[PDB]
């Protein structure tokens, strides 16, 4: 499709991971790499993401 | 089974995606994958090193 | 250091859990002794911090 | 292997801090670990008793 819109082939298949996605511009060397992986999160960076959630709640009282 | 009922799957580290244009053939373009450690469906994914892929070129009208 | 500037020392080496720190006060047999272990979180807990998220954004609105 | 790539280390419970003052030595403060359990770098950690130790003095100038 024209680059106004096209998009990622839809995919639901639960065994395999996304890695990311590449676009290819049309007749052309160039190609434009990006990163989506589903990347982990620790016990610590839950206690953090929880941090700042108690920092929007007493910013917002 | 455990790990995936517990969280699924996920990415540790690595698999970053980077075009690099190797002509290897005029039709294609060439991406690399970096090394890599991910769990997918629960079971360990564990790569050493990048890994190169190929992309054809769009040519429909 | 003086008491207004003294920092805990400073570590990366993943082989080590931080239990807390000990904070002598300077010529004296007291010390100020505090926590800092990252605890886990259940999936209760992340579901109450989503819970928390739908009442902010809903304080939102 | 499979904890540290999901969950980094973290304390399950106890591990509090406490300054007796145990005077065992007139240069060094006594303190007390409390009892606790932790998993770090992967592998699982417990010790059922309050767990004493000690901290020299600050006489630098």
């Known amino acids: ?61 | 089974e455990r790990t995936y009922d517990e969280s699924g799957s996920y990415k540790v580290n690595g698999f970053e995606l980077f075009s690099e244009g190797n002509a290897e053939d005029d039709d294609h373009v060439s991406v690399v994958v970096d090394a890599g450690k991910a769990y997918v469906k629960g079971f360990k994914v564990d790569k050493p090193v990048s890994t190169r892929i190929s992309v054809p070129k769009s040519y429909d009208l």
Request: net charge negative.
């Open chain 1, 1 to 61: 499709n024209i680059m106004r819109l096209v998009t990622p082939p839809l995919n639901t298949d639960p065994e395999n991971l996304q890695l990311g996605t590449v676009t290819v511009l049309p007749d052309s060397d160039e190609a434009v790499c990006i990163s989506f992986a589903i990347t982990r999160l620790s016990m610590e960076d839950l206690q953090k993401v929880k941090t700042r959630v108690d920092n929007l709640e007493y910013n917002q009282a």
